[PDB]
């Protein structure tokens, strides 16, 4: 049998994207949107079954988020929204989702370790839970009436609570898992209506079981399914887990939960679970083998899969083994059959969702003796291509056996005995002003030199006149996507035409694709950066994108360990740094916006990640002078749990985030750490259109002088000004300089 754990909910050409925004625009109504949603929903079920898909999921579709879909299912709507009861419709739903013009929208956080963000529920002891949304049962019927039987996918009761958060007031000591009693009754009613409509299988998504859970929490799972058993009578229950391997303890709790008859394992990222199963599995319980990476974009190693699936068939195979995606296809793109610009051979090497739906089957039939030989013949051939094609392997893939020359710390020169030189070369005043990288746009017409400069010099003619700014920037005009920019200008980067993935709400991201060994044969920055530092007699911050960000925000190849690719990228950058140097750019800022992003969900693994991660950064500027100043830029307000790694990046002046945090948190530097190096946390919120005050800045900018060590303190924004209007930033920045001035004055 075959099974897909989840599917994208936007469309092949992002139909729901515009249908969604549209309704919110006010240029379309429910009826029309509903028309679209249901239509897309139909096309998916139809598309899925017609491929042979045995277990087709329903309820994966969402108007915004799945955890919200379940927040409405439990009527767990926040007070400030004014819900009185009854069936929750587009009003209350989209409120919570994106707020209205009188109340704010709920907080969204990252989905486990994915590039997806969900809407964290706000729970507490005073919320009145109720069956407020028949989306599940409704969709089940819709699919049945269309001729296709589906498996309702529900977010596990306990994962739901663990993923939630206690809303304001709820005293610190309140345990969220203390609500299992108020929510479980509702799960029952829902599970009852599904049995009632015909459902013969259900799916509780309990991904949190792949997390490091304490025995008391693991035990929380046990009490839920115990209490659920009766309602689960006569009904196959598939409990899904994904993104990592299951801890041996979690494996015990899982494989012994009540009513659960099937178990979903992510065997792409959690093959380590293979052992646990190899060493013991329930009897007549199913094992959905998640061997088809629904998380990347590459074809599957059909052969490999069969080996894995076969031995699995070994353990059981008595018809209890089901082929499945490693996780929800929500995390991969839709149709690779919308990838035109991409040459043949390369695409021959990729497979998006729709394509993956099919693989699951070629592998399901091949395990049932229906092995469509024409598929493996082609696959294996495409595998052959990739592993050979000189578009992959290289001699750059040799400059690596030299990076084994011990670490790559920036040439002894303790940053402290290095600042002494950087300053000399450019005498800057205490609390040096500056920006982050990007700048607001104008007309913006989608030669180019005569025009490009016109804008760059205005960006500079401004930086100068405008609030001095001890160090200006070129405002990244020539760069749309800070990661794409460099990809197009690189070796192992291909770009897809319609390969989109969702990020949150109606928003998405088309990540560059890293197919082979990265390499920068020609100068990328230099030109524009050099052109900029000549239009002034002030330090100019050269601009680069750290190799960790690039890696993360891009579909990296599943053939060699991340870092290995990360490093290749790190080396490529090492150039543009020593060229903006030769070129004559003094100060240079390298940014790592997505550094914490690639953090493994398994705690004993954070160490290894942060390792190659921060090292690859060094590898970028380890061949730089002692007078060449370096700035790193990360988009985080928290480093408390990763302050050491910041200390190992060896940045002369690191610029991070802040704006809406404490002035005291900054002592995570001045405590048992002793950073001792230019630090610059943001003093102006750029996601808040609204202008700040000269008075507001210079006081918090004083609450840094007294929490840090004003003597290595910088004055910069919060992040690039790319998404702020010139009118919102002009008065704004101006007030960020006056602050330093005064404060200095004394
Ligand atoms: N490589 C690259 N990848 C990225 C980012 C980047 O900086 N560069 N920044 C990221 C953080 N998340 C988001 C989520 C949504 C949007 C967004 O608003 N997207 C528009 C399209 C934006 C566009 O024109 O690109 C949409 O509606 O689909 C932008 C960043 C994620 N991935
Ligand atoms: N400075 C760059 C990278 C930060 S995300 C920018 O402003 O886009
Ligand atoms: Zn930032
Ligand atoms: Zn260290």
Swiss-Prot record:
Q: How is this protein annotated for GO cellular component?
A: apoplast; chloroplast; chloroplast stroma; cytosol; peroxisome; plant-type vacuole; plasma membrane; plasmodesma
Please tell me where 5-methyltetrahydropteroyltri-L-glutamate binds in this chain. 17, 115, 507-508, 553
Keyword Manganese recorded = no
Report, as the record phrases it, the tissue specificity of this protein.
Expressed in leaves, stems, flowers, siliques and seeds.
Output the superkingdom of the source species: Eukaryota
Q: Which of this chain's residues are annotated to bind L-homocysteine?
A: 436-438, 591
The EC designation for this entry is 2.1.1.14
- Binding residue positions for L-methionine: 436-438, 476, 591
Where Zn(2+) 1 binds, per the record, is at 633, 635, 657, 719
Catalytic residues (positions): 687 (proton donor)
Biological function? Catalyzes the transfer of a methyl group from 5-methyltetrahydrofolate to homocysteine resulting in methionine formation.
What name is this protein filed under?
Answer: 5-methyltetrahydropteroyltriglutamate--homocysteine methyltransferase 1
């Amino acid at each position: 049998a075959s099974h897909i754990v989840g599917y994208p909910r936007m469309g092949p050409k992002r139909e729901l994207k515009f249908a969604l925004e549209s309704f919110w625009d006010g240029k379309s109504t429910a009826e029309d949107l509903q028309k679209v949603s249901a239509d897309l929903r139909s096309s998916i079920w139809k598309q899925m079954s017609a491929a042979g898909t045995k277990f087709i999921p329903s309820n994966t579709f969402a108007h915004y988020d799945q955890v919200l879909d379940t927040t409405a299912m439990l009527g767990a709507v926040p007070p400030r929204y004014g819900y009185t009861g009854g069936e929750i419709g587009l009003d209350v739903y989209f409120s919570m989702a994106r707020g209205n013009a009188s109340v704010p929208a709920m907080e969204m956080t990252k989905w486990f370790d994915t590039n997806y963000h969900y809407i964290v529920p706000e729970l507490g002891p005073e919320v009145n839970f109720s069956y407020a949304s028949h989306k599940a049962v409704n969709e089940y019927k819709e699919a049945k009436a269309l001729g296709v039987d589906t498996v309702p996918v529900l977010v596990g009761p306990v994962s739901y609570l663990l993923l939630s958060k206690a809303a304001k007031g709820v005293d610190k000591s309140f345990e969220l898992l203390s609500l299992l009693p108020k929510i479980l009754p509702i799960y029952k009613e829902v599970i009852t209506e599904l049995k009632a409509a015909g459902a013969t299988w259900i799916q509780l998504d309990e991904p949190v079981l792949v997390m490091d859970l304490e025995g008391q929490k693991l035990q929380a799972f046990t009490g839920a399914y115990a209490e659920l058993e009766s309602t689960l009578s006569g009904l196959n229950v598939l409990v899904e887990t994904y993104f990592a391997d299951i801890p041996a303890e979690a494996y015990k709790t899982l494989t012994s939960l009540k009513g659960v008859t099937a178990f979903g394992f992510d065997l792409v990222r959690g093959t380590k679970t293979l052992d646990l199963v190899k060493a013991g599995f329930p009897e007549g319980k199913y094992l959905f083998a998640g061997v088809v990476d629904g998380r990347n974009i590459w074809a599957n190693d059909f052969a490999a899969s069969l080996s894995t699936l076969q031995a699995l068939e070994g353990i059981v195979g008595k018809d209890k083994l089901v082929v499945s995606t490693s996780c929800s296809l929500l995390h991969t793109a839709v149709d690779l059959i919308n990838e035109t610009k991409l040459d043949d051979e390369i695409k021959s090497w990729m497979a998006f969702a729709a394509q993956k739906v099919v693989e699951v089957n070629a592998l399901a039939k091949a395990l049932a003796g229906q092995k469509d030989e024409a598929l493996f013949s082609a696959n294996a051939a495409a595998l052959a291509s990739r592993r050979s094609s000189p578009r992959v392997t290289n001699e750059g893939v040799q400059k690596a056996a030299a990076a084994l020359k011990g670490s790559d710390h920036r040439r002894a020169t303790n940053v402290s005995a290095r600042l002494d030189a950087q300053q000399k070369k450019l005498n800057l005043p205490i609390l040096p002003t500056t920006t982050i990288g990007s700048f607001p746009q104008t007309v913006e017409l989608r030669e180019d030199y005569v025009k490009a400069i016109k804008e760059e010099i205005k960006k500079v003619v401004d930086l100068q006149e405008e609030l001095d700014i001890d160090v200006l920037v070129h405002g990244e005009p020539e760069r749309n996507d800070m990661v794409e920019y460099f990809g197009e200008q690189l070796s192992g980067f291909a770009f897809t035409a319609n390969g989109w993935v969702q990020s949150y709400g109606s928003r998405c991201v088309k990540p560059p694709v890293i197919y082979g060994d990265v390499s920068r044969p020609k100068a990328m920055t230099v030109f524009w950066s050099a052109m900029a530092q000549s239009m002034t007699s002030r330090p100019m911050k050269g601009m680069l994108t750290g190799p960790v960000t690039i890696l993360n925000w891009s579909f990296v190849r599943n053939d060699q360990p991340r870092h290995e690719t990360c490093y290749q990228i790190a080396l490529a950058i090492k150039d543009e740094v020593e060229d903006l140097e030769k070129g004559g750019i003094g100060v240079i800022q390298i940014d790592e916006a997505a550094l914490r992003e690639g953090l493994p969900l398994r705690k004993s693994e954070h160490a290894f990640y942060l390792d190659w991660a921060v090292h690859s950064f060094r590898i970028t500027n380890c061949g730089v002078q002692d007078s060449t100043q370096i700035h790193t830029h990360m988009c985080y307000s928290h480093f408390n749990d990763i302050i050491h790694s910041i200390i190992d990046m060896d940045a002369d002046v690191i610029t991070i985030e802040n704006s809406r945090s404490d002035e005291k948190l900054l002592s995570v530097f001045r405590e048992g750490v002793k950073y001792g190096a230019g630090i610059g946390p943001g003093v102006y919120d750029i996601h808040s259109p609204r202008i700040p005050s000269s008075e507001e800045i210079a006081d918090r900018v004083n609450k840094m002088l007294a929490v840090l060590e004003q003597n290595i303190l910088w004055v910069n924004p919060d992040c690039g000004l790319k998404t702020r209007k010139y009118t919102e930033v002009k008065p704004a920045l101006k007030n960020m300089v006056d602050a330093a001035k005064l404060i200095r004055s004394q």
